[PDB]
Amino acid sequence: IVEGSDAEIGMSPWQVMLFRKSPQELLCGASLISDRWVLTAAHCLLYPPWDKNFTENDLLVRIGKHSRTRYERNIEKISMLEKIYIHPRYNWRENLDRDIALMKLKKPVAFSDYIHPVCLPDRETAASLLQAGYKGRVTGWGNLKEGQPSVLQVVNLPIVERPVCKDSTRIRITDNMFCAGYKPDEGKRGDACEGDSGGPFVMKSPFNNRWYQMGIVSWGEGCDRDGKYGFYTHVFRLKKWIQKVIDQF
């Protein structure tokens, strides 16, 4: 995260770190949506242009974390994956349309002060909250600029109007994406960066005071560049697929 701040303890108890087993390293962000299901970006797992294709046994999920590098004894929990599910119409070839994946854990994680699931939106919350100018929150252990943070970073960013999103890029934007960030003359700054991919964009509903994950960090050209915006997978638009997987698995 660029131009973010250190998270508070327990501020994002749904944050998940996707961790490469060998060599050990951050791969991506992710989110906890139940005691056995983890949500991430498809490109974190499958991106043939970069020879990326991970299988279950390649990875660990680390939940409850704050420090990036440290092993947080008696706090984080580390989980193995039972099965990865990538959207069947994920478009890695062109623009990362439908950039979404689920991971099924081998065993349920115990919830704690530091470990708790986020909600996924219903149609009515999505309609109410996904509006230009409304702010969400992005969290992650990725780059601080286009070093790496000691602890989880947080930044609040406004949703941008669809024509501004489209006019900022040569990439074809779809209905399964939205973009967020400040415009050059808004003063404030901030963005996701490498390593933050697959983590959540969340919003706090003013109707029931619960946090909802509206987006998944998906792609951006550079990090925190003026006139550019970060793109996020639109979680509500892909909810049928999520439900079908959880229902069928």
């Binding site: 050990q24 660990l60 092993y71 580390i78």
Partner: peptide, 9 residues
Amino acid sequence: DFEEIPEEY
């Protein structure tokens, strides 16, 4: 950079 994770994982 990453601290050692318990062998059991």
